[PDB]
Structure 1
Amino acid sequence: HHAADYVLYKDATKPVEDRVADLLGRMTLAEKIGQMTQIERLVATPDVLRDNFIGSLLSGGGSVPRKGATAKEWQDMVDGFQKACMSTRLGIPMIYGIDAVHGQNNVYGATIFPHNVGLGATRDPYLVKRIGEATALEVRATGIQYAFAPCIAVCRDPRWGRCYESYSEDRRIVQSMTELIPGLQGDVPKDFTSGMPFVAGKNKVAACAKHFVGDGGTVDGINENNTIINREGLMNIHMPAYKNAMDKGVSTVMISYSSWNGVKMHANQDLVTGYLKDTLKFKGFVISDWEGIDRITTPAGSDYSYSVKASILAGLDMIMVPNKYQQFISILTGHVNGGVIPMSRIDDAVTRILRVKFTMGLFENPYADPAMAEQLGKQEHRDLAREAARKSLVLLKNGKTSTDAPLLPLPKKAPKILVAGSHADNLGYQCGGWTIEHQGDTGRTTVGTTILEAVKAAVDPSTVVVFAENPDAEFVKSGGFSYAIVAVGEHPYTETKGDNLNLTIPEPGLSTVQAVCGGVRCATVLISGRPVVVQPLLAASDALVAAWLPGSEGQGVTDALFGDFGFTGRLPRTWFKSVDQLPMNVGDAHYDPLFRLGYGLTTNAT
């Protein structure tokens, strides 16, 4: 268009499909396969990115330039990688992805929002939208353009170690919370075609609905195992939120490690190509999970040639290798060179990858915006997270008998109060998994406000606040306490080790609640990623609050304990009486819950 060295794909005024086709028709097989390859930052260097025409990088959980890195360190890392990609012959910018699943959670100082189960308790899709918006800003603060979220798993058994990543056992709640998508990506246009990818621009990020499909239905909630259920239950429980995601223009879809009636999702042509692509008309890109194609075989990794063939023929577009890029590229090249994988399949994968990159404006803004750095941890975002944490809490008990004075809301003025328990002053525990590290961690791992700090920030200046993590019964009886706040619950976990058959919280937890509550009236704040065995905690407590994993802003808990707002959260999951009942979901066979889905007591603001 009017310039002698004009190249259509580099013209920002041209339609996405014309730019995609113009670039595709120029590309070598190596350039195409390179687009289909995502690698860890851990194995990336400028030479590797350029020489192998790499399409994408990620940080997996915990993969950071260093502990404590600033927003600008992250931007410089990403820009460094981008500079190498932009130096290739075609200058195709890479997309950098990360798990920003409750805020930009690998990053020191990022606001940490409640995990999804808690957000399910809010029944507030617009709140979740706003969390998508703020999350996109904090992701862009670190120069990253792609978030592996939302997890739209419908967790059907809380024994799953990722159940906290599911908004609900009820697909309708999960469906409603796909509002995260236009938060992260921006609202789609008036006349948008369902299935088309969308990202508004450099202040938004590409999203990822994950993990397709039936990841929350696995047998015994075993991570990555088999989901046994007929087409009718897959389609009526596990699938419908994918269609909501298509309707809101989700840019990518990550495949599950799990199998459906014994067929690995990473090899399932019928569901990946026949259904997602050809029926839902998904036109963005399909990405593997981490070594997901390796896991097609048993043992994993034992026929990588097969893994590459099966996956790429099933319809996956981009492979999260994430380490052995040379072997992946080599193998896929050999398959294409020997006619095992046709060029039409490569061309489809590359079309989709490029369609997402061009749509989102990556060719126009490949580099980080330094003015966005200050969005990290922004106080407006913390206020939003604090609102979310507050709305997530479900009050399960407020008085031992129907005749007692309600314990909550507590008075902010009292001569002396006790805050106690393993979880009262532990930021990492109140954040849970996928915070700083993959598995979360213990202690002051980022910037936030623990429940103890929140108490001290809320009470009258005459109120003496005593902290003891695990006091004995005598300490409490002698203390002259008006009341106690005791917080206990689960330790941080994920998939690999959150898979638990007993669901009873670690000691000391119960023993501390018993010592505290046997001495003074007590409000027990239970921190968990899921329902856990709760009868003994309930029997000891005057009041008991399921706080889930509320994130960095512990003042959302005290906002409700001290009556600045009323409790409004409702269970988004069934609370079982015994683990022997499981699986047990609302609508079931012999449904006998301790608390049904939807239960929650309320209070009025004081």
Structure 2
Amino acid sequence: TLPYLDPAVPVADRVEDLLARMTLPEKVGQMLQLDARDGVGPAVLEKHAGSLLHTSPENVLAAHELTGRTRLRIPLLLAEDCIHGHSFWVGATIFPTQLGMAATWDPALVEQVAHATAVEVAATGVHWTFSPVLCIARDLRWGRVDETFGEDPFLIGELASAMVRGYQGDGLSDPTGILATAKHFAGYSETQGGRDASEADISQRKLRSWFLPPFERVAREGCATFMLGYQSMDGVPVTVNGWLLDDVLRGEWGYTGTLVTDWDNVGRMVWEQHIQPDYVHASAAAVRAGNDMVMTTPRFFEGALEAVDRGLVEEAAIDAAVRRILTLKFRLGLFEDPRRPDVARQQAVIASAEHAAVNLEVARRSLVLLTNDGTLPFAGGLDRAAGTPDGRALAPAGAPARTIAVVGPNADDDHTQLGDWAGASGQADWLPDGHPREMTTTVLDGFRALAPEGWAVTHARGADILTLAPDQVVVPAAPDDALIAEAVAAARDADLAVAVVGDRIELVGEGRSTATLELVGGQVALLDALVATGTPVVVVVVASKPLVLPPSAHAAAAVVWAANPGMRGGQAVAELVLGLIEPEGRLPISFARHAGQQPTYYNVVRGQHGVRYADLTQSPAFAFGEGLSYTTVEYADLRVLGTEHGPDDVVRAEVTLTNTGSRPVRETVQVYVSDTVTSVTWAEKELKAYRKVDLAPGESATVGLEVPVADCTLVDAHGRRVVEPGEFELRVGPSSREDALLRASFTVAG
């Protein structure tokens, strides 16, 4: 012999030979992507599924056996959520979440993480990850903020671009490449009330302005698949959204990759959004819109078959989607090698020492020091034994004996440190105990391993967070006088209190947005009492997203943001506190002071009558881009080199940095552009470029910076992204805070 099995025959002729042999049920089934946890046998044999997701190691082997017993033996696409490492493979390298990764501001490193993930994913026989996420974190109430790269369209685009690159490798023939997905297209991250898949009140212009740019970038860079979002947008779910699917993705951008829906998009139009009377008309609606793969709506099988039989859609429309799906399977070479899992390759590459070292680097660079009164680096900073890199620190001069008290509900919590979409977070049913405990260094673990011989590390759970009850629902723990008293005693007998607080899985993710953003349970009372002991308190926030921190945390000696820092995360936190590394992370997202303060992202649109709420400043608790080091850096003398520009030029600038302190630093210079007068109201400023700079103590450097004129765009009325001629301002400094930015005018001419 048959031509569809002949590798010497062109792919389009192979497609048409196979298609002509297929029954209509076999074609509809090729559009299904089914939940393997419900049983692989019926899915592959009775429904005739093209794809499976959530496939346990046992079911991956069973799926291949069942394909051999089907009439046409069309090989399966096996897809999995491999969200920050290979989430659901016991013993895989689990990296920080996307939000933590974004604090490194380092695309080259994020590419290494995606590549290391793909290497592990490929060995287990998975072909396709639903990753990266390109949603833009605009409402902190939203439960999936941890899955984003933050609040800035440019930074999201840089890092999402790096993940697609690293996942896909050299392309559809790379044995260590896998398909990447551009996820939640588009606008899923800003819906009414910060709720999960409520109405998105987003116009075409607002979508183009703040949400589309990362998607357009990865579409043009060859992202294999796009995933269509849950939410209705101006009344229309993305699944049947003609403007978004035809005018934008397939029209303006000319995207030729494969579409997949999100879990049960087609059925939700019946039972949750109430825009379709039944599943036959939902299926027909989905086919008209030009969908390819339909995820976890099993009744699309009988619904699309009946829709064809009744004349609601043509069989030709089924054919066109099947032609696209088969083309992908043929170009991957699956009919020649369907990329089975290889146990010899699993043992060679999964959780290898190279991958662990990439993981430690991301953890070290993702930590963001938000406040410091001088307590840190603790005892002036520690050294390791001169002979051995790594290993336990030496007791420094001026501090022979110290006691560090590690307290708080997240101080020794394996699962919470890894976050959602990993281990036992709940979406896979084959990892009851999560990943092996010994692969994670918790905060307590890290200090026990690093503290000098003559020091001591004590522990006390100081609070609980929550318990579950029936209306299912979270019950916040009460403050617990005994639990608190035990931590206060540990602190009273110590030189330093490290309080590790935050959230946990029942307060995070799908269907679990939060309204208050506050620490839940007895954590506030624990922080209050620890600060009142007079022992210096370091607040380490291990949480999925930015939280409102109580006053006692702003009165503590220091505050570290860690964002679910992965398996190495607790080694990095202890290294940071003891001064064995310098801090490098910088916020990719803003922290609010109260949920009602929002919006608190840096790129606010101009126009407000006033600058504050009557009962609250509009200034965020911590702003996008900020973060401390253990030294001081002066920014001086910003100059644009030739302030007049035409539309094809590059704005070029120079700025001078001086390290005026005593420790080295890797500084992240941020470059914002402001369009002084605009034809439609626009953001006061936008991030456009950035640069990392290494400074030895005392070193001084003049740094070149550039921004193409073509990047100084807005979305006008009419929805065109255009550079308008006129006056601009270049704002350069260590954060998005206006009192930290040097500024310089430039102009762009018609």
TM-score, normalised with respect to structure 2: 0.72
CA contact (8 A) 2:97 2:146 kept: yes
Rate the CA distance shift 1:94–1:453 in 2: closer, same or farther, 3 A: same
Q: SS at 1:20's partner residue? A: helix
2:355 is matched with 381
Give the Cα separation in 2 of the matches to 1:244 and 1:13. Answer: 34
Q: Cα–Cα, structure 1 residues 433 and 25, in superposed 2: closer, same or farther, change >3 Å?
A: same
Of residues 239, 243, 248 in structure 2, which corresponds to 1:275?
248
Identity, % of aligned positions = 31
1:511 corresponds to which of 518, 522, 525: 525
| Residues 235 and 306 of structure 1: CA distance in aligned 2, closer, same or farther (over 3 Å) | same
Confirm whether residue 164 of structure 1 aligns to residue 146 of structure 2: yes
Match of residue 420, structure 1, among 389, 407, 411: 407
CA gap of 1:204–1:164, structure 2 versus 1, over 3 A, is same
User: Structure 2 CA distance, aligned partners of 1:518 and 1:15?
Assistant: 75
2:499 alignment partner in structure 1: 486
Q: Is the 8 A contact 2:424 2:433 kept in 1?
A: no
Counterpart CA distance in 2 for 1:15 and 1:485 is 63
Is the Cα–Cα contact under 8 Å of residues 419 and 486 in structure 1 kept in the other structure?
yes
The reply to whether residue 340 of structure 1 matches residue 356 of structure 2 is no
* 1:317 alignment partner, one of 274, 280, 292: 292
Q: Name the CA distance, whole Å, in 2 between partners of 1:200 and 1:494.
A: 37
Which residue number in structure 2 is paired with residue 112 of structure 1? 94
Deviation at 1:43, TM superposition (A): 2.6
Alignment of 1:354 with 2:326, yes or no, is yes
Q: Which moved more, 1:245-254 or 1:551-560?
A: 551-560
**1:469 and 2:482 equivalent?**
no
- Look up the SS of the partner of 1:243 in the other structure: helix
Whether the aligned pair in 2 keeps the contact of 1:428 and 1:442 (CA below 8 Å) is no
Residue 568 (str. 1) matches residue 584 (str. 2): yes
Which residue is 1:501 aligned to? 515
The residue aligned with 2:53 is 58
1:570–1:139 CA distance, 2 compared to 1 (3 A): same
Aligned-pair CA distance for 1:342: 2.0
Pairs within 5 Å for 1:436-475:
436-439=423-426, 446=436, 447-470=439-462, 471-472=484-485, 474-475=488-489
Q: Counterpart in 2 of 1:306?
A: 281
What residue number does 2:477 align with? none
Report how far residue 443 of structure 1 moved: 8.7
* Residue aligning to 2:719: none
Residue deviations 1:151-198 (CA, integer Å, cap 9, x gap):
1111210100001111011111110012101211114xxxxxxxxxx5
Structure richer in helix, relative to its length? 1
TM-score by structure 1 length?
A: 0.88
CA shift for structure 1 position 10 = 2.1
Residue of structure 1 in register with 2:202 after alignment? 229
How far the C-alpha of 1:287 sits from its partner, in A, is 0.9
Larger Rg: 2
Q: How many Å separate the matches in 2 of 1:272 and 1:37?
A: 20
Q: Identify the range of structure 1 (433-442 vs 495-504) with the bigger mean alpha-carbon deviation.
A: 433-442
Matched, 1:398 2:372: yes
1:70 corresponds to which residue? none
Amino acid at match of 1:600: G
Contact 1:140 1:372 in 2 (8 A): no
AA aligned opposite 2:564: L
Q: Structure 2 counterpart of 1:530, which letter? A: K
Structure 1 counterpart of 2:211, one-letter code: H
Alignment partner of 1:219 is 2:198: no
Following superposition, the deviation at residue 130 of structure 1 comes to 0.9
- Does the C-alpha gap of structure 1 residues 405 and 559 become closer, same or farther in structure 2, counting only changes over 3 Å? closer
Aligned partners of 2:417 and 2:542 also within 8 Å = yes
Counterpart-to-counterpart distance in 2, 1:416 and 1:495: 37
Separation (CA, whole Å) in 1 of partners of 2:560 and 2:46: 55
Aligned to 1:543: 558
Shift of 1:569: 0.9
Q: Distance in 2 between matches of 1:278 and 1:543?
A: 51
Q: Identify which of 23, 31, 34 aligns with 1:36.
A: 31
Structure 1 counterpart of 2:744: none
**Counterpart check, 1:594 vs 2:621:** yes
For the aligned residues, what is the CA RMSD?
Answer: 2.4
Amino acid at match of 1:318: M
What residue number does 2:236 align with? Answer: 263
In the TM superposition, residue 103 of structure 1 has moved relative to its aligned partner by 0.9
C-alpha displacement at 1:556, in angstroms? 2.5
- Cα distance change on mapping 1:182 and 1:199 into 2, 3 Å: farther
Measure the CA separation in 1 of the matches of 2:198 and 2:30: 30
CA–CA separation in structure 2 for the residues paired with 1:435 and 1:477: 33
2:144–2:510 contact (8 Å) kept in structure 1 = no
Question: How far apart are residue 356 of structure 1 and its match?
Answer: 2.1
Q: From the superposition, tell whether residues 431 and 477 of structure 1 become closer, same or farther in structure 2 (CA, over 3 Å).
A: closer
- Residue in structure 2 matched with residue 429 of structure 1 by the alignment: 416
Alpha-carbon deviation of 1:405?
A: 5.1
* Counterpart residue identity of residue 100, structure 1: C
The alpha carbon displacement at 1:264 in A equals 1.1
| Distance in structure 1 (CA, Å) of the matches to 2:29 and 2:287 | 14
For structure 2, the 5+ residue unaligned runs are 383-392, 396-400, 463-483, 612-617, 631-662, 666-750
Please name the residue that 2:44 is paired with: 49
Q: Which is worse superposed, 543-552 or 341-350?
A: 341-350
Structure 2 CA distance for aligned equivalents of residues 537 and 19 of structure 1? 67
Q: CA deviation at 1:428?
A: 0.8
Q: Deviations over 1:345-370 (max 9, x none)?
A: 21221122122222233223212223
Per the alignment, residue 130 of structure 1 pairs with 112
Q: State the Cα distance separating 1:262 from its structure 2 match.
A: 1.9
> How many angstroms does 1:513 deviate by?
2.8
Distance in 1 (CA, whole Å) between partners of 2:52 and 2:509 is 23
Q: Residue 140 in 1 paired to residue 122 in 2?
A: yes
Contact 1:160 / 1:222 at 8 angstroms: preserved in 2? yes
Partners of 2:540 and 2:525 lie apart in 1 by 14
- 1:284 and 1:353 in contact (8 A); partners too: no
**How far, CA to CA, are the matches of 1:200 and 1:130 in structure 2?**
19
Q: What is the aligned length?
A: 570
CA contact (8 A) 2:406 2:460 kept: yes
* Residue of structure 1 aligned with 2:7, choices 7, 12, 22: 12
| Shift in CA distance, 605/349, structure 1 to aligned 2, threshold 3 Å | same
In terms of fraction of residues, the more strand-rich structure is 2
Residue 598 of structure 2 corresponds to residue 585 of structure 1: no
| Other-structure match for 1:524 | 539
- Which gives a bigger RCO, structure 1 or 2 (Cα 8 Å, sep 6+)? 1
- Is the 1:424–1:486 Cα contact (8 Å) retained in structure 2? yes
SS of structure 2 residue aligned to 1:532: coil
Cα deviation for residue 269 of structure 1 reads: 2.2
1:190 maps to which residue? none
Q: What SS does the aligned partner of 1:297 have?
A: helix
Q: Following TM superposition, by how much is the alpha carbon of 1:461 offset from its aligned partner in structure 2, in angstroms?
A: 2.6
1:514 touches 1:540 (CA, 8 Å); kept in 2? no
1:27 positional shift: 2.5
